[PDB]
Each structure stands twice: as C-alpha cells, then as structure tokens.
Amino acid sequence: TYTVGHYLATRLAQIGLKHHFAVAGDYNLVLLDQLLKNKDLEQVYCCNELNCGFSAEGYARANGVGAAVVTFSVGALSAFNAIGGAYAENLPVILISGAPNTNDHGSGHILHHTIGTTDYGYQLEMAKQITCAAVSITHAEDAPALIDHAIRTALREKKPAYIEIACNVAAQPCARPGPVSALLNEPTSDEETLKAAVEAALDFIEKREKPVLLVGGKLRAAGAEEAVVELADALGCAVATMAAAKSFFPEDHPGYVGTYWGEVSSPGVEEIVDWADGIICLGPVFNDYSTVGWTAWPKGENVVLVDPHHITVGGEEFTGIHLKDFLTALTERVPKKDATLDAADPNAPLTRAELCRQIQGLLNPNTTLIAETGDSWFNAMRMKLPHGARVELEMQWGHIGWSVPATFGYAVAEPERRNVLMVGDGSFQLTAQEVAQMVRRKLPIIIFLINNRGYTIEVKIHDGPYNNIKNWDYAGLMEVFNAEDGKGLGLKATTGGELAEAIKKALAHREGPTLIECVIDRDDCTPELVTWGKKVATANARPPQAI
Ligand SMILES: Cc1ncc(C[n+]2csc(CCOP(=O)(O)OP(=O)(O)O)c2C)c(N)n1
Ligand SMILES: [Mg+2]
C-alpha cells in the first residue's frame, strides 16, 4: 500500500527525476526512507543544504526538472537561496522539507530547529514568497492532491515549488498516483489571439527590409529552442543572443552573428542591431546587468517582444498566447528578409587570453561549459561553440559558488558529457565542499579554478579591501577529499604550457574530477568587464531625484 513517501517518489520519477538530492535530518528521516522505495529514483546526498538545493538547480538544467529534501527551517532556510535562484532562472526545482509532528501543530509546544515561538508556519510563509506553489501536508488524505498541485504548477510555470510534510505523516498510507498526464498537459493559446498576434507581427517585418532576431534568456522555459531555428531559417535574418541565452541558439546556422550585450557585445554584433529595422526579442530579461547600466535596452516602436505568455507588437498587446505556439504559426507566413553582416607562447606567465583560448580547445559537441558569476561570464561569451555544445550561466540570480554544486548536479543527469567548469577563486570558496561529492560519485568533471586572488569582477565595479580574499592552495584540496577511497586529480598551471599538460591529464583521467588552479593576474581581464563595471557601478549608486 502506497504512502506519502512513495507517492512523492513516484510522482518525481514519472515527470523525469532519476535522482533527487537530500540532506539527512530527524524530520525528513522517515520521509527519506520512503523516497528510496522507488528504484527508478535515486537518493543523492550532499554536504550542506545551500549546495543541495543548487545541485537540484543544475540537475533541472539537464533533466528539465529537479528536486531536493531538507530538515525543517535549519535546512530549508538556506535552500531558499537556491529556490530564489530557481525562480530567477525559471527552473522547476521542487523543494521538500520535513516538518513538525501533526500532534504538535498549534499544541503550545516549542520544537527544535525552530525560532522558539509556538508557531511553525513561518517557514512556508517565507517559501510562498519565493515559490510559485507552497504546500504543507499535515494529513495523509490530503497528500496526493496537493503534491500533484505543487508539481503540476511548477512545470506549467517553469518556477520552483515547495512541499513541507509532517515527519509522522510521511509514513501514513495514501492513494495511488493517477496517470502522469494529469500533471503535464497545458493550456494552449487561444486561436483568435494567436491568429491576430501573427498577423500584426508579419506587418512589423513587411514594412521593413532589415530585421534582426534577438534570443532571450527565457527561451528554454518556453521549450521553443526548436521553433526559433525554423524561424531564423524561414526568415533568414541575422540572429543574435542576449547576455544570457548563450548556446540557446546554435552558432552554426547562417544567420547567427554572435552575442548582443550592449556596448560590450562580442565583436560586430552591436552594430547589426543598432542599424537594423526592428528587433524580435524572444523572451528576454532586460535588467541593470543585461542592459549594461540601462544603456542597451530595446524600445517598443521598433521592437516585437515575445515574452512567454504575452506578446507586445508596436501599438498592440496580446495575452493568452505562448511563445512556442507563436513561433510555430509565424514560421510559415513569414517572408525571407535578410540583413547580412558583410596562438600564444608557452613557458611564459599565463594570460587570461591564453587559457580562454586553450579552454576553447576542449569544446566538444558533447560538452557543457558551466561559467560561474565573475569575469568567467565574459570569457564564455567570446568562445565559439560547436553544434550540440551547451553553456550554463546563472545571471538573473548570480549567487557566486552556484557553479560548483550545479555542476555536480548537471553531471549526475548527463554524466557521459564533458562537463567543464569555469569558476573564480572567490566563488569557489563559498561552495567548495561539494567537489567532495563529485569524488564520492566519481564524476569526469574538469574544474578550471580561475585563480586571481580577489573578487576581480567586484574590483572593477568599486574596489576596496573587502574584495581581497585569503588565498588557498586550491590545487591541493582535491587530495583532502579523495582521502581514503576517492580518485580525483588536483593540478596547477602558472604558464601557457603547463595548461596543456593539465588539460591532457584531465581528458585522460577517468573515475573522478580534475581541478586545475590556473593562476593569473587580477587586473589582467576581459575588456568587457572593464567598461561593464563602470555602467553597473554608476547605475547602482545613482542619486535619488527630489520631488
Ligand atoms: C553569495 C554572493 N555574495 C556576493 C556576491 C557579489 N559578488 C559577485 S561577483 C563577486 C566576486 C566573484 O569573485 P571571483 O569568482 O574570483 O571572480 P573573478 O575574480 O574570477 O572574476 C561577488 C562577491 C554574489 N553575487 N553572491
Ligand atoms: Mg578570480
């Protein structure tokens, strides 16, 4: 006879999860036992919850959805930082927490892992704030209807959910899951709006000769990566990707120019959009960083904005549509308008140009490049990508240290890929211990620890003593985690040559991860980050305007 544990386990497996991540605790202990009972759904463990949640973050980038489990408040409050990151990056990460007993609710008791107050709702009062759905199971009869809700909403919205489950309830007997289809099927557009939406879009381009395509960050949540390719071709115009959305459009196809990111756009892409007649943004995320100090933000007269569920065209609005259904019906009536555009030395000290070049050697169609918040953002946005090659940024949320646990998670879902991690010295320190799990699971990850002895990106926004961080022997950390049983390489590289030696050892090494402490100079950095931090620093601290 099924139980709340089984029902949640199965519901996760049905929608996709081969792995759910967890951190033991006396509330979720009984619950965790029953999450094992499903054998198509494996219980991965983690060092702390802040990371555990970020690992489910990554996993959802590869699978499409992820999940985690934690103890009451003490575990979940840290995870909320990842659930914020999920909502930010449109990831259907499903958090789950253990919770007090049923007989303690409103019972005047104080419990452990809580504030000391007699109330325990404060947790999912918080969670609600950062999650599309928030659900407390306190009776096993409720269970299956609410779990379905939490999952169903998360997937429709492409935003995270929350499920707290009283420890003693987790065990109790529950119903059997209904067919999975109950959760997945979605409301589609309305034909009448859809019809008109396309018609007004056609006029936007057919009163012009030089259109452009701009690929937004939210494209992956809409599931429209395919339909953009069939539009870029059927239309033929010059495509460009945004700050995010790197590797959301393939860099083979003839229209792809590069990356548009304001006055720090990769060579030759700022000009095409400025010059052109109108811009077709497909689910963008313009903000103080994406617009680069509010300088590079498309208007409305010469802009079509095709956000996930609501489409603005010059002088008109539409709602109740979908980005995908819009780009399917568009890629048929669209006419073909075009806007055509027209080594280093080894042995010597290692330059940011050298390893950004040499790292581009690794880029296999079976490769996913995880670029951490930092200057590493700008390196990835210069690198040419093969077809099928992926890049993962976390720009909306930007928690440093996200990369490490999210690389661990991404790798559990896609272990046969070549998983490559560009992480700075400072970011790495926040979440380093989750490398020990890459060793535990024996995953072939290639960590490029961009060591520069400081928060270099933060230096070029506004410098100070707060940016100088204690330095580690980042290379030697690997050994400490390998300890008795693991197998994982820990290397260094102070020269352009040493890098090639380390990279060969990395591709060579199996049975675990490979870190490379690529030392470089702080002020040696991309020319974008230089001119970029200025726009952010002044916009950040622009003065109020008196009334
Ligand atoms: C948890 C968290 N704390 C602080 C910040 C602000 N912040 C953004 S980047 C950054 C510095 C990153 O340092 P590092 O990885 O070394 O960047 P690099 O020097 O490689 O460019 C800081 C402190 C943040 N985004 N997240
Ligand atoms: Mg650094």
Numbering used by the authors: 2 to 343, 359 to 563
Provide text from the study.
Pyruvate decarboxylase (PDC; EC 4.1.1.1) is a thiamine pyrophosphate- and Mg2+ ion-dependent enzyme that catalyses the non-oxidative decarboxylation of pyruvate to acetaldehyde and carbon dioxide. Bacterial PDCs are key enzymes in homofermentative metabolism where ethanol is the main fermentation product, and as such are of great interest for biotechnological applications, including second-generation bioethanol production for use as a renewable transport fuel. In this study, we employed ASR to infer an ancestral bacterial PDC designated ANC27. Here, we present the crystal structure of the inferred ancestral PDC ANC27 at 3.5 Å resolution, show that the enzyme is fully functional and compare it with known extant bacterial PDCs.
The final model comprises four chains of 563 amino acids with a molecular mass of 60.6 kDa, each with a TPP and an Mg2+ ion, together with one water in the active site of chain A and one PEG molecule between chains A and C. The final model contains four monomers in the asymmetric unit, each comprising part of a dimer formed with a symmetry-related monomer, with the dimers coming together in a less tight interaction to form dimer-of-dimers tetramers. These regions seem to be very flexible and have not been included in the final model (more specifically chain A residues 344–358, chain B residues 343–359, chain C residues 343–357, chain D residues 340–358 and the N-terminal methionine in all chains). Each TPP binds as indicated by the domain nomenclature, with the pyrophosphate group binding to the PP domain of one monomer and the pyrimidine ring binding to the PYR domain of a second monomer in a dimer, thus creating the active site in a narrow cleft at the interfaces between the two monomers. The O atoms of the pyrophosphate form hydrogen bonds to the backbone amide groups of Ile473 and Thr472, while the N1 atom on the pyrimidine ring forms a hydrogen bond to Glu50 (from the second monomer). The Mg2+ ion anchors the pyrophosphate group of the TPP and forms interactions with the two O atoms on the diphos­phate group of the TPP, the side-chain O atoms of Asp441 and Asn467 and the main-chain O atom of Gly470.
